[PDB]
Write an enzyme that holds these catalytic residues in place. Structure first.
Site, PDB file in Angstrom:
ATOM      1  NE  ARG H  97      -0.807   2.167   3.230  1.00 15.43           N
ATOM      2  CZ  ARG H  97      -1.785   2.349   4.487  1.00 15.43           C
ATOM      3  NH1 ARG H  97      -2.955   2.296   4.643  1.00 15.43           N
ATOM      4  NH2 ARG H  97      -0.763   2.047   5.599  1.00 15.43           N
ATOM      5  CG  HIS H 102       3.080   7.284   0.361  1.00 14.60           C
ATOM      6  ND1 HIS H 102       2.661   6.678   1.219  1.00 14.60           N
ATOM      7  CD2 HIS H 102       3.016   8.884   0.686  1.00 14.60           C
ATOM      8  CE1 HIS H 102       1.830   7.339   1.829  1.00 14.60           C
ATOM      9  NE2 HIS H 102       1.907   8.654   1.739  1.00 14.60           N
TER      10      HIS H 102
END
Ligand SMILES: Nc1ncnc2c1ncn2[C@@H]1O[C@H](COP(=O)(O)OP(=O)(O)NP(=O)(O)O)[C@@H](O)[C@H]1O
Ligand SMILES: Nc1ncnc2c1ncn2[C@@H]1O[C@H](COP(=O)(O)OP(=O)(O)NP(=O)(O)O)[C@@H](O)[C@H]1O
Ligand SMILES: [Mg+2]
Ligand SMILES: [Mg+2]
Ligand SMILES: [Mg+2]
Ligand SMILES: [Mg+2]
Lengths: 124, 132, 132, 129, 130, 125, 131, 131
Positions: H97, H102
């Protein structure tokens, strides 16, 4: 309050010590929880402002309470009058106490005549 | 103004009275009446200086003096008089407090030094009060 | 007490210093230096009287006087000094203030009357305090 | 008493110093030294009031103040000060804890603008002996 | 580790910077009361943050219940988490909360700025190592 | 020792649309020394006015005879909200409101720690 | 270095949002359309927090107590303006609820950000590059 | 299971199905970023719901308040509420994730496909264990 502890610390640290007085709440009996111990000393010379503060903190550590150490040789006439009237002598000769009181009361009586106008003006 | 000028006159008179009684200074150290006169006109000088100071502290609400010396401390703190002059005028109070009693705690050398190199301080004080 | 004997000695010396300076009084009203020496030694007699009163009021726990006059008043209430003498010593402090702080307003006729007659009020006080 | 005289003067001095430092308010929100002065002088007014209160309770033998707030309750109970004055002076006792402890300015300004009169009101009732 | 320790350390650092920034050389210090007031308050904030760090370590490490603000430093010194000189110096600062208010003593304030700011920095570094 | 009923009554009587009351200082842990602060956290439908909050903190302080720190959880930082969720003691409110608040702050603090970790490490040598 | 990569990611994400969005008559109905912009809007937020936190770390500004604090520290130290700081802080909430939580009718505020607040991200990366 | 648990379970069920719609044959997936952006978002929504469950149980059961999402699963595993292999797979999922949102430029993409095809039932296993 350990007055013997107070007398020993001050005698061991102040040269030419003449008088030790306990004033404020502790001398009267109004000594509460977060109370500040008030001590007035008189020696042959004046104690340095820094030196006196550091010594008050030494007493503060040993007594486990905030202490206000007053040098009578450099304190105001108002403060000296408060000590001669409310204070309890812990150390020194009866003569030195009497000599200090006579000088103080006279100086305070003279100050009252000088500042009476200033006192009246603020107190309305 | 009316009282500040009255006290200025008394200082000017007393300064002149010191100078007249002292004169050369040769006879001063021996004659007691000459000492008694000078001691009193020095006392009248610093007492009139305190009287001026306390009047300025009253009209300008500078503070409440905790000592006679505190009268000059309040003027110095409020930058009305220069710090070295304040210290000198406070030294004069010390002389008065000792000289109010009998001449036993005597220091004629201190009295002589004030007449010679310190009477200028009382005059210097008058010079800064005039600038109101 | 040692402070009392020391102050009594002071009054005795200053009473004798007034008697010597004044002398006959022929040159007293004329000379300012003789007036200055008499007024200073009268103040020294007053201060040593006030100092005795202040000492006795503290030591005997009669109260704390915040004025020179209250100190004599307190002695009279506790019957240590007679009331006519108290009011006489209070009037002597009164003369001291006008003789020092306002010398121009001072009337020497009152000062002369004190030297000639009221100079025994101090001697009367010296003996009544000596009888402990 | 000199305690009462000198403490009244301290309050007077601190109020004049708060009013002076704060001024209009424009410069107050940008300078932390002005904020710090106002804050410290408020605590000084508060402790001078607590000190005056404690001295009166002791001399007039009203009781033993068990806390800083209790010094004001004892005065109000003895009808020396009004209950709203007491309640307002008690509100100031909490100011000391606002500066020293971070514990994660509108309140300071509100106090300067509205609660300085409470200290002045207290001086006035004490002066009236 | 705790957000109390982190933030109280951050407070001391910020207050020390502000003490140094305001005081500077010390020339304008004795004249402007605004500069004096700021230094004192930020000094009081350093004392409190230290006492709060002390009280938190005494509870977490289960060293005893401090009987006063000074006893808080005694319990730390007794367990050798801080040196006896450090303990005594931090205790001198406990009395500094009383100087601003109950008085009216600027020489003392100047002395603390010049010689005792190091004590708070010493304590920060000591606590940092867990 | 501490009148929790007085705390609940005073806050309920002064805060409109009140949802949660928490006690979270030394008192919630029992480490409550003498001359201690009472630390209270509240959550209402709307964010409280700063002055209204301070005035109410002083109203509680008078009634409880102790310094009172009143925190509005709706405006409090994530760090401070996390302190309340960890060491706090719920005095009033639904289990639903408490559990919802708790899961909202734990998630926000976890996301915050991810972001500020390097800052924390950097300042903690 | 990390700020340069973070600025580059922001530009990449804004251009990605504009490509997926375009017209409004394809947003309120398609879910894959919504999911693409919502993620790239979060990516914009997260990268702005990272730029802020790198500056806060380098310049030693303070410790953020909230995600919003990352921008507050910048404004308190006069690196970004209060109106910009306030706009970026309002955008953190968008990332918070409207992105990693299922949501309901927050879409009307999501479209408002797309057509009016994508410039706030641009103003921020231009201010940071300028120093 | 209380409201918070029910509402969070419902989010995982809805977001898993949402990934399935966006992932049919999965041919045009590795070429279109819009399809990847929807899969990554709903996987994060699935992750976040599981963290929220774990955070809720850790507080209710007095196991401690975790500082991180990783610590939340370790706390659940240490008090035997979940198995170590499940705790490790869920921690691998949140790690995926973080890379996915990011650091999109350094995302494997092959692992994302492997997660959808095989490791998607790890969320489903967690729903059953907590039930
Ligand atoms: N502003 C002041 N003016 C004159 N004298 C003062 C002043 N403040 C304090 N004092 C004197 O110093 C003494 C001690 O000060 P302080 O500690 O404030 O009072 P306290 O009676 O000992 N109360 P506490 O220590 O709080 O229990 C007082 O009893 C007074 O004699
Ligand atoms: N700087 C801070 N950052 C984060 N949380 C804090 C901070 N300061 C205080 N807190 C929190 O607020 C609570 C209460 O604050 P505080 O009143 O200062 O401490 P305390 O433990 O209650 N001590 P005391 O009231 O003096 O007995 C603490 O227990 C923390 O959870
Ligand atoms: Mg005291
Ligand atoms: Mg004291
Ligand atoms: Mg507390
Ligand atoms: Mg608190």
């Amino acid at each position: 309050l350990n007055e013997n502890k107070i007398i020993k610390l001050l005698r061991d640290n102040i040269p030419k010590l003449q008088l030790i007085y306990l004033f404020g709440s502790y001398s009267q009996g109004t000594q509460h929880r977060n109370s500040d111990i008030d001590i007035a000393v008189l020696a042959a010379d004046t104690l340095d402002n820094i030196a006196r503060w550091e010594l008050a903190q030494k007493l503060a550590s040993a007594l486990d309470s905030d202490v206000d150490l007053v040098d009578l040789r450099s304190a105001s006439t108002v403060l000296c009058q408060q000590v001669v009237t409310q204070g309890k002598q812990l150390w020194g000769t009866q003569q030195d106490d009497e000599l200090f009181a006579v000088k103080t009361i006279s100086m305070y009586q003279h100050l009252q005549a000088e500042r009476q106008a200033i006192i009246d003006d603020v107190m309305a | 103004n009316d009282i500040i000028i009255n006290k200025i006159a008394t200082i000017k008179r007393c300064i002149k009275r010191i100078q007249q009684v002292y004169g050369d200074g040769s006879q001063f150290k021996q004659d007691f009446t000459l000492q008694d006169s000078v001691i009193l006109n020095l006392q009248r000088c610093c007492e009139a200086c305190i009287d001026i100071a306390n009047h300025i502290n009253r009209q300008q609400q500078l503070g409440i003096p905790q000592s006679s010396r505190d009268s000059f401390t309040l003027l110095a703190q409020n930058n009305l008089i220069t710090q070295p002059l304040s210290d000198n005028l406070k030294k004069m109070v010390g002389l008065r407090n000792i000289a109010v009693h009998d001449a036993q705690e005597l220091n004629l050398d201190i009295v002589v030094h004030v007449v010679q190199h310190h009477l200028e301080d009382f005059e210097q004080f008058i010079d800064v009060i005039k600038a109101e």
